[PDB]
């Protein structure tokens, strides 16, 4: 088999930065195709026959290479270029590369924090859901802690994060604490505490069960 190996599997660039990924075959190959993918949508074909830019692609993009090493190159990274890019050649097996997740690095943004108490309609069905929004922040990593009255909560919440926004390039996080009607109404204060590089001081958000 000819095996395609992509490097670097994950990488980051600031605006204006020249970036150069690489797809390497374990043998010789005469051409290399590249496809761009952003989360949850069909991969767009991006660069074909090693160097030829597919319709609609910005010219700041360029591809090239020969034989044993082909590459993809952006003369100056831009927000909308942050995506996963797969190299691909038909004589190769597996046919596709494992891709390179190109991320855009930028000035730090502190998250806005919002908390949501369980909705009335939900309660009258069995369980409870207290949602915490860390919104529009850079970079990805943030700590979130749930504080039910005194206590801190463990093994009863779950997180999920968006991909890099195309506009500003920020992330956004959501935590769901799940605890039954019983244990919801067995307590008073509900808090959400947030840590971040942009956050000089933690942020807390809270509410009491029956209060306004």
């Amino acid at each position: 088999q000819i095996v395609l190996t992509q490097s670097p599997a994950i990488m980051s660039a600031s605006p204006g930065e020249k970036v150069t990924m690489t797809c390497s075959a374990s043998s010789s190959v005469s051409y290399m195709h590249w496809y761009q993918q952003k989360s949850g949508t069909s991969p767009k074909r991006w660069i074909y026959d090693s160097s030829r830019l597919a319709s609609g692609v910005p010219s700041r993009f360029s591809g090239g290479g020969s034989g044993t090493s082909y590459s993809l190159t952006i003369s100056n990274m831009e927000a909308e270029d942050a995506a996963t890019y797969f190299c691909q050649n038909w004589r190769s097996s597996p046919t596709f590369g494992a891709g390179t997740k190109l991320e855009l690095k930028r000035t730090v943004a502190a998250p806005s924090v919002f908390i949501f108490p369980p909705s009335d309609e939900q309660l009258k069905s069995g369980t409870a859901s207290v949602v915490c929004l860390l919104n529009n922040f850079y970079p990805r990593e943030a700590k979130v802690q749930w504080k039910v009255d005194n206590a801190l909560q463990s093994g009863n919440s779950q997180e999920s994060v968006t991909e890099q926004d195309s506009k500003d390039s920020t992330y956004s996080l959501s935590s769901t604490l799940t605890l039954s009607k019983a244990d919801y109404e067995k307590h008073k204060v509900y808090a959400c505490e947030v840590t971040h590089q942009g956050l000089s001081s933690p942020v807390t958000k809270s509410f009491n069960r029956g209060e306004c």
Binding site: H33, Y35, T41, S42, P43, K44, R45, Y48, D49, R52, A54, F86, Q88, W90, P94, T95, F96, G97, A98, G99, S112, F114, F116, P118, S119, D120, E121, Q122, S125, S129, V131, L133, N135, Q158, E159, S160, V161, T162, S172, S174, T176, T178, E211, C212
Partner: protein, 222 residues
């Protein structure tokens, strides 16, 4: 323009077989091969095979040993893919693609079809609001659904700025949950109406939920 239209998402119990469609338009249906590409979380893009419509010719990716039966129907402009006997290794997104004008590259792509393979039963989502208080933030919690996926949008498509629809999370329960939220000036939360449109086709559910300020009866005014 060239377009490929895939069948909806599916749930099949292991060891059954799914047959998924791709409807091709805007080209000579028989000049171009139809390529089928698989994709799981973690494993990226793998090629399953291809059919050149109605020339009897079709190529099986070695990996699949007769399981991926690539057919076509030249006067329906529809190509098909049947997957013979199902494990959860099949649970993925499947694409069809048409190769370029003069060039062996996948130049046109389907929208994708999510197949989920599990013995578990279909469940529609419970949709609960995420009600603003105090640039305010509101949304919907699309709870307790199966299988993936659900779509979420706001004001039937009219509202898209500041919308964050999160990845689904598998719960301890074996059911999924996701959130969609939107931020909006709080000086509109009087009579600017906000509705999240939740469609989950596997259970044929559609929910149009108004997210309202739960402004209670304890306080005063604004």
């Amino acid at each position: 323009q060239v377009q490929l239209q895939q069948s909806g998402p599916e749930l099949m119990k292991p060891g059954a077989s799914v047959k998924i469609s791709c409807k091709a338009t805007g080209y000579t249906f028989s000049t171009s091969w139809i390529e089928w590409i698989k994709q799981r979380p973690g494993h990226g893009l793998e090629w399953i095979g291809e059919v050149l419509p109605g020339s009897g010719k079709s190529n099986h990716n070695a990996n699949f040993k007769g399981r991926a039966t690539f057919t076509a129907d030249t006067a329906s402009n529809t190509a098909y893919m049947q997957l013979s006997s199902l494990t959860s290794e099949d649970s993925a997104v499947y694409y069809c693609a048409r190769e370029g004008s003069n060039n062996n590259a996948l130049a046109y792509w389907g929208q994708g079809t999510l197949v989920t393979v599990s013995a578990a039963s279909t469940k529609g989502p419970s949709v609960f609001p995420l009600a603003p208080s105090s640039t305010a933030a509101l949304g919907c919690l699309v709870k307790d659904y199966f299988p993936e996926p659900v779509t979420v949008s706001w004001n039937s498509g009219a509202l898209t700025s500041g919308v964050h629809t999160f990845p689904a999370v598998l719960q301890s329960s074996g059911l999924y949950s996701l959130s969609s939220v939107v931020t909006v000036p709080s000086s509109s939360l009087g009579t600017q109406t906000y509705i999240c449109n939740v469609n989950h086709k596997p259970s044929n559910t559609k929910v149009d939920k108004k997210v309202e300020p739960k402004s209670c009866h304890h306080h005063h005014h604004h």
